Amino acid sequence: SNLIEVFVDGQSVMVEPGTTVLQACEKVGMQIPRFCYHERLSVAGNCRMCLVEIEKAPKVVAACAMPVMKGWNILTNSEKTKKAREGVMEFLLANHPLDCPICDQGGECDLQDQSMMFGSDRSRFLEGKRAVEDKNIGPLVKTIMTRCIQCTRCIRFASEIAGVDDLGTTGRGNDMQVGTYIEKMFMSELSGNIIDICPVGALTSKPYAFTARPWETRKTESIDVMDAVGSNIVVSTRTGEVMRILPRMHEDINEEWISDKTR
Amino acid sequence: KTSFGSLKDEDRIFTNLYGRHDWRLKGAQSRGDWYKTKEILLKGPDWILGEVKTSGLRGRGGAGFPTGLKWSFMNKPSDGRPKYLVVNADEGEPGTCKDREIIRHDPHKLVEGCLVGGRAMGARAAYIYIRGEFYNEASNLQVAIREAYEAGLIGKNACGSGYDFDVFVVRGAGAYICGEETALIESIEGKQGKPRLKPPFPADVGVFGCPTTVANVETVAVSPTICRRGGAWFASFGRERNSGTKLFNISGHVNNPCTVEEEMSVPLKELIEKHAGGVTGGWDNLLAVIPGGSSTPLIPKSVCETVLMDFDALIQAQTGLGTAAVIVMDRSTDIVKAIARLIEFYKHESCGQCTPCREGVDWMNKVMARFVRGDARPAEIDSLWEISKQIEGHTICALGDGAAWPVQGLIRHFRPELEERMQRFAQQHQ
Amino acid sequence: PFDNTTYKNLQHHDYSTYTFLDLNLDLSKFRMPQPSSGRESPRH
Amino acid sequence: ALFVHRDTPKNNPETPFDFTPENYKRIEAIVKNYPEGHKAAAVLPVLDLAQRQNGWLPISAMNKVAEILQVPPMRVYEVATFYTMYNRKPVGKYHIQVCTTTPCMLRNSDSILEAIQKKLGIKVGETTPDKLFTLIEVECLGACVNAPMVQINDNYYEDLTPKDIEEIIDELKAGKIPKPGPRSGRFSCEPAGGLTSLTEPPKGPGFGVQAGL
Numbered sequence A: 001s002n003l004i005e006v007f008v009d010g011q012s013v014m015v016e017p018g019t020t021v022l023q024a025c026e027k028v029g030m031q032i033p034r035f036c037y038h039e040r041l042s043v044a045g046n047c048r049m050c051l052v053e054i055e056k057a058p059k060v061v062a063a064c065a066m067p068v069m070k071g072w073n074i075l076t077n078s079e080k081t082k083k084a085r086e087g088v089m090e091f092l093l094a095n096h097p098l099d100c101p102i103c104d105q106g107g108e109c110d111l112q113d114q115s116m117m118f119g120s121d122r123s124r125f126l127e128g129k130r131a132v133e134d135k136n137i138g139p140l141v142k143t144i145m146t147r148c149i150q151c152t153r154c155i156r157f158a159s160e161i162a163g164v165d166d167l168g169t170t171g172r173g174n175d176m177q178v179g180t181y182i183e184k185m186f187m188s189e190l191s192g193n194i195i196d197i198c199p200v201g202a203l204t205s206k207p208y209a210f211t212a213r214p215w216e217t218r219k220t221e222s223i224d225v226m227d228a229v230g231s232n233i234v235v236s237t238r239t240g241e242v243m244r245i246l247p248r249m250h251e252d253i254n255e256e257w258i259s260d261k262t263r
Numbered sequence B: 001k002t003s004f005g006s007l008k009d010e011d012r013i014f015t016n017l018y019g020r021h022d023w024r025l026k027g028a029q030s031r032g033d034w035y036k037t038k039e040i041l042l043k044g045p046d047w048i049l050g051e052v053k054t055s056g057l058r059g060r061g062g063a064g065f066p067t068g069l070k071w072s073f074m075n076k077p078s079d080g081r082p083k084y085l086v087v088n089a090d091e092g093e094p095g096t097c098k099d100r101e102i103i104r105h106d107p108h109k110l111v112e113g114c115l116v117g118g119r120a121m122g123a124r125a126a127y128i129y130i131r132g133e134f135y136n137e138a139s140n141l142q143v144a145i146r147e148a149y150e151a152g153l154i155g156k157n158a159c160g161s162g163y164d165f166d167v168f169v170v171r172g173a174g175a176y177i178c179g180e181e182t183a184l185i186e187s188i189e190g191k192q193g194k195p196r197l198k199p200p201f202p203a204d205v206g207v208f209g210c211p212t213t214v215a216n217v218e219t220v221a222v223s224p225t226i227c228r229r230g231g232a233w234f235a236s237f238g239r240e241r242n243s244g245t246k247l248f249n250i251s252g253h254v255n256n257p258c259t260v261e262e263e264m265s266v267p268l269k270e271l272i273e274k275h276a277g278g279v280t281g282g283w284d285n286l287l288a289v290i291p292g293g294s295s296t297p298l299i300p301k302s303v304c305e306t307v308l309m310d311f312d313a314l315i316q317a318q319t320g321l322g323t324a325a326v327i328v329m330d331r332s333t334d335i336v337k338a339i340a341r342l343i344e345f346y347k348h349e350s351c352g353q354c355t356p357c358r359e360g361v362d363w364m365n366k367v368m369a370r371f372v373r374g375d376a377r378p379a380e381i382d383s384l385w386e387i388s389k390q391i392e393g394h395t396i397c398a399l400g401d402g403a404a405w406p407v408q409g410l411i412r413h414f415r416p417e418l419e420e421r422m423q424r425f426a427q428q429h430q
Numbered sequence C: 001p002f003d004n005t006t007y008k009n010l011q012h013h014d015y016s017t018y019t020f021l022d023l024n025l026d027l028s029k030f031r032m033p034q035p036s037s038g039r040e041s042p043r044h
Numbered sequence D: 001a002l003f004v005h006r007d008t009p010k011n012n013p014e015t016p017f018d019f020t021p022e023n024y025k026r027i028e029a030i031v032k033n034y035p036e037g038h039k040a041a042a043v044l045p046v047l048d049l050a051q052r053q054n055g056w057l058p059i060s061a062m063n064k065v066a067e068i069l070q071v072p073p074m075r076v077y078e079v080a081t082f083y084t085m086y087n088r089k090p091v092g093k094y095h096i097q098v099c100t101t102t103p104c105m106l107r108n109s110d111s112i113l114e115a116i117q118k119k120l121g122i123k124v125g126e127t128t129p130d131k132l133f134t135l136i137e138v139e140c141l142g143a144c145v146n147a148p149m150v151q152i153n154d155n156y157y158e159d160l161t162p163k164d165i166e167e168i169i170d171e172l173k174a175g176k177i178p179k180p181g182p183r184s185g186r187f188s189c190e191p192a193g194g195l196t197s198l199t200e201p202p203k204g205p206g207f208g209v210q211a212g213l
C-alpha cells in the first residue's frame, strides 16, 4: 500500500495519496465546517470556511481542496484556525439578511448551526446590507437570493449531476448574483435536489414553504414507490400529517438525491 | 558595489523605451534584438535555465519569485500534453504602465523572449494575454509577430533551429483580476476570470490542463538580453538576491511623471529627484509614497529619505516592491480620499469568488468612505485593522492581500490624521 | 542620421476597429497545427 | 448596471444579430488559435468581435456566440456580465472612459470629468441625446505616468487639461478623429523636460555578448 502518514491534531492516520485535508480530518471522526464543499460535487474552494492550520506553516490552507503532504500535523482546533472560522463566518453574516424567523431553512440551517458552533456571537458590521432581486426558476424552487452565500452548489449540481448548464454567476464582486440571467425556468427531473444542497434558505421548497419547521417533524425512514429505483426517503410528518419528503443516503441507489416526482 | 543607481545607457535592456526608434523588425535587429537567437536556442533548455538562475532574475510581475527556479518547474518529461508559456501582459495595477511601454515600443524583444523562454521550458506556443484596454499595443505587437513569422524567426523552424514555436495574442476584456496568473488562465480558457486554488500550480495544471508558466512581460523580455549579455552581467547590478535592472513608473505628485529603466537597488529619493524632477513643491512637500503600485503599503517621508528600491529593503520597510510603480503624494493630498479611492478600485476589481474579498473588500470600502468624512469613532480604526487581517491570508488569490495592505499602511502611518478627521466631524456635527 | 527627436511609433494613428482581428486572420496561415485533446469538447 | 436580463422589444432573442461573412472568417481564425477540443476558449474574442460589429451586445449576440462555439448560453452570459467592456446596453458612438483612480485623481482627473460633464451637458453614465457620446468613469487604464487621461473606443488621450479634452470633444463633434497621444509636449512616456536617460545611441547587434554563444 502507498498510504502516507499524516497527523490530525497529533493523531496518526494513514491516507491514500491525493487525500484532501478535510478527508484526513474526517477519517479520525472530525468534521470541518464547510459551505461550498459537497462530497458529491466538484471542489470549488470559494467559501474559505474550511481553512485549517497546518503546523510549521504560516498560512491556513483550504482543507476542502488541499491534498495532504507526508507528515502534516493538521490543527483543527488551534487559535488561527478558530480565528479563520470566525472571520469567514463574519463575512458570511455581514450582508446576510435577518430573515431567520421568515426563513424555511431555520432550524435546519448550516449557516445558523455553524454560526453557533464556529463563529463569533455578535456583529461588528455597522453598515447597510445588500438586497438581491429574487429570481423565478420554477414553481418548485422558491428563490430568495438575498440569503445566498454564493457557494456555487447550484451551478456545480446543475452542471455535473443534472447536466443542465443553465445556472451561473452574473456580475463581479459583491454584486455577483447566482441565477440564470434571463427569465428561464430550471425544470429538470432532479431540479428539487438544489433545495437539499443549498446550505441556506436562498433556494427553498415552494410546496413546503411556510408550512412546517424541522424541529417538530417526525422523521420516518421509508422507500419511494414512484419509480422502480426504490429510492430511500425520509417522510417527515407533523401532528399526523405528511409535511415533506427528503432523501436518505443509500450509496447504491439514490446516492443522496431523489427525483422531483418523489420530492 | 555598495551604493546603487546611476545606470549607464550602454547597460540598458530596454533601449527604445521612449518610442524614439523604430519598433519594427529592421529597427529591432539594429539594436541588438534577434541576434544569435539560434545559438541561444540550440544550447538546450538546461543552459538557458542556468543563465536565468545565474542572473538572479526575480519575477517582475510583482511578487518576485526566482525566475529560473520558476521556469525550471517545466524541465520535466512530456506526459503527452503540450506545454505553454503564457505572457502576462494585463498590467492592471494603478501606477504601473511599464508593460504597455514594452509592448508598444520593444515588441520584438517580447517575441524573442517568448521564443527563448519557451525553448527553456520546452513550450509549444506563447499566449500573450494582453490587456483588452491596450488595443493599439495589441495590434502593434501583432505587426511585430507578423514580421517575426515572415522573417522565419518564429513558427515552423524558428530561427533555423528546428524548434517549432507559435506566438498568440489573446486580448483581455476589462478585468484587473485577469492579471492574476490562474485567473488569466481561466480567462484564456473562455470563462470568468476567477483565480484557481493552488495547488495545482500552473506548471502541473495550467492553461487548458497543460503544463504552463505564466510570466510577466518584463521578466520575459529581459531574458534574451540575459542570454546574450550573460547571467553574470545581469547579476552585477543591484544588491544580492536583488539583481538586475528594473522599469520604474514615477507618477502622481512629481514634476515629470515618467517611465525609466534604472538599476535595481537605487534609492527612492535619488530616483524621484533624478528622473522625475522631484516632488512638486520640493522634497519637504512630500507626504507619502506608494512605492510599488496600489497593492503595496505606503511609506511616509521619514522612510523615503533612506530606502532602496528593491524587494528586500522595501520588505524591511514593512511594505513591498511590487511593480516598482512609485506613486508620489504631496502635502496637499487628502490621503484618506486617495486610499479610500484605492479600496474602491479593489472592490470594483474583485471577481466575487471567495467570501473574505467579496464581502470584506466592500465592507472596507464602506468603512473607508465613512473615514473620509470622519463619520465614525476611533474604535472603528482598530476594528478595520482586524477586518484587513481577516481578509489577508484567507483568500484564494492575493487581491485580498492587495486590498488589505493599503488599509494597513494608512492606519499604521496615519492613525492620528484619521482620529483628528473623526473628532472634527464630531465637533462640527454635534 | 541619428534621430532622437521624433516619435517613430506613428502607425497606431491609423488602426481601425478590425486591425487586430485582420492581423490574426493574416497570421492564421503561418501557424503550426493545433494539438488535440482527443474529443470535440469536455461535454462530448 | 443590472445583471439580470429583461426582454425589451429592442433586446430579446428575436433581435436581429448575425455576423458578416468576413467576421465569420475572423471567427475561424480566432478558433484556430486554440487546441482542438477547447473551442470554448474562443468566447472572449468572438463576443468582443460582436461588440465591434454591433457596438453593444443584445441577447442575440450572446446566443450566437453560444451557438457557433457549441457552448451553453449561460457560459456566454457569465463572460458578458463579468468583463466590463461588453456593453449590454447601447452606448454612444464615442465611449468616453475617464480614469479616476489614485494616480489620475492625484493629477486632477476631477477637473476633466467636470469639463466633459459641463461640455456635453450630461453626467456619468448618461448618453448625449444624439447618441454620440457616452460618459462613464472607469478604473486604471494603465497610463499612469501620462495622467490625467481618457479612453475613446480604442484610443488613449493623455496628459490632458480641460481645454484639451474640450478641443477633442469639439473635433469629435465635427467628424474628424484626433491623435491618440499626450496633449502636453512629450511623445509617449519620457520625462517632460527632456530625456534623463536613453540619450546615447543604441549599440546594436554584438554588444556585450558573452563568449561561447
Ligand SMILES: NC(=O)C1=CN([C@@H]2O[C@H](COP(=O)(O)OP(=O)(O)OC[C@H]3O[C@@H](n4cnc5c(N)ncnc54)[C@H](O)[C@@H]3O)[C@@H](O)[C@H]2O)C=CC1
Residues within 6 Å of the ligand: B059, B060, B061, B062, B063, B064, B065, B070, B073, B090, B091, B092, B093, B096, B179, B181, B201, B202, B203, B214, B295, B320, B321, B322, B323, B397, B398, B402
Ligand atoms: N503587475 C501588475 O499589474 C500587478 C502585480 N501584482 C503583484 O502580484 C503579487 C502577487 O502575485 P502572486 O502570484 O499571487 O504571488 P506569489 O505567492 O504567488 O507567487 C509568485 C509566482 O511564483 C510562483 N510560485 C510560488 N510558489 C510556488 C510553488 N511552490 N510552486 C510553483 N510555483 C510557485 C507562482 O506560480 C507565481 O507565478 C503582488 O505582490 C503584487 O506586487 C498585483 C497586482 C497587479
Ligand SMILES: Cc1cc2nc3c(=O)[nH]c(=O)nc-3n(C[C@H](O)[C@H](O)[C@H](O)COP(=O)(O)O)c2cc1C
Residues within 6 Å of the ligand: B058, B059, B060, B061, B062, B063, B064, B065, B067, B070, B088, B089, B090, B091, B092, B093, B176, B177, B178, B179, B180, B181, B214, B215, B216, B217, B219, B397, B398, B399, B402
Ligand atoms: C490580483 C492580481 C493581479 C495581478 N496582475 C498581474 C498583471 O497584471 N501582470 C503581471 O505580470 N502579474 C500580475 N500579477 C502577478 C501574477 O500572479 C504572477 O506572479 C505574474 O504575473 C507572473 O509571475 P512573474 O512575476 O515571475 O512574471 C497579479 C497578481 C494578482 C494577485
Ligand code: SF4
Residues within 6 Å of the ligand: A096, A097, A098, A099, A100, A101, A103, A104, A105, A106, A107, A109, A110, A111, A112, A147, A199, A200, A201, A202
Ligand atoms: S439562510 Fe439561515 S441564517 Fe439566513 S435567514 Fe435563513 S435560517 Fe437565517
Ligand code: SF4
Residues within 6 Å of the ligand: A147, A148, A149, A150, A151, A152, A153, A154, A155, A178, A197, A198, A199, A200, A202, A203
Ligand atoms: S443559492 Fe444556495 S446553493 Fe446556490 S450558490 Fe447560493 S448559497 Fe449556494
Ligand code: SF4
Residues within 6 Å of the ligand: B177, B194, B195, B350, B351, B352, B353, B354, B355, B356, B357, B358, B395, B396, B397, B398, B399, B400
Ligand atoms: S479574493 Fe477576491 S480576487 Fe481572489 S478569488 Fe476571491 S473574489 Fe477573487
Ligand code: FES
Residues within 6 Å of the ligand: A033, A034, A035, A036, A037, A044, A045, A046, A047, A048, A049, A050, A051, A062, A063, A064, A065
Ligand atoms: S469548504 Fe473549502 S472553501 Fe468552501
Ligand code: FES
Residues within 6 Å of the ligand: B093, B094, B095, B096, D099, D100, D101, D102, D103, D104, D139, D140, D141, D142, D143, D144, D147, D149
Ligand atoms: S491610474 Fe489612471 S491610468 Fe492608471
Ligand SMILES: [K+]
Residues within 6 Å of the ligand: A105, A194, A195, A196, A197, A198, A199, A200, A201, A202, A203, A204
Ligand atoms: K435550502
